[PDB]
């Protein structure tokens, strides 16, 4: 497939790294949005319940826990179907679409989760994070960032 943005030895590459990654999804989904409101802090008024907090307060916090893991897991979405161009494309830009209803939501918004993405995945696999990995990563969160933007304007 023409659309998808790696070779087939990558997107093995990917889904193996991933998996592994997974096992702690809803961790590394929880310091993804807190990377999230310490590099942008405009951000957190966006949900006004987080505005008060410290970065543990938040991680202990159910109502982040909720909203962590509703933004890790269409990444997770998006890795199982790397096989599957045409649901990866449907599932990506409907994510796009919620923030639609979102009062003040810009386009350029979402750019700022890829680097919030590559740190929570450097900080979950640590050793597992290769010279390699960081590559596709790059790469990859990129395009899916694309495809997010594309359910926005739309
Ligand atoms: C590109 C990465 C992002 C992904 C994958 C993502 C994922 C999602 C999903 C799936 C929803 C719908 C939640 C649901 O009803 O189940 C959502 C809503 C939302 N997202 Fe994002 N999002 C991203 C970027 C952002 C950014 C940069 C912000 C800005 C702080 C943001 C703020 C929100 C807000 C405020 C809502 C609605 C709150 C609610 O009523 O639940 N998101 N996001
Ligand atoms: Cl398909």
Aim: proline letters at 5%; one cysteine or more; hydrophobic letters at 35%.
């Amino acid at each position: 497939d023409p659309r998808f943005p790696l070779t087939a030895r990558d997107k093995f590459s990917l889904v193996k790294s991933w998996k592994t990654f997974s096992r702690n999804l809803e961790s590394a989904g929880k310091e993804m949005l807190l990377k999230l409101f310490i590099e942008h802090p405009d951000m957190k008024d966006l949900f006004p319940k987080f505005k008060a907090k410290t970065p543990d307060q938040l991680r202990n916090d159910e109502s982040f826990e909720e909203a962590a893991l509703a933004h890790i897991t269409p990444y997770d979405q998006a890795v199982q179907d790397s096989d599957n161009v045409d649901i990866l494309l449907t599932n990506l830009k409907r994510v796009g679409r919620q923030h639609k209803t979102v009062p003040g939501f810009q386009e350029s918004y979402f750019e700022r989760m890829e680097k919030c993405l590559v740190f929570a995945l450097q900080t979950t696999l640590a050793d597992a994070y290769t010279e390699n990995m960081e590559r596709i990563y790059k790469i990859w969160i990129s395009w899916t960032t694309e495809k997010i933007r594309e359910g926005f304007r739309e």
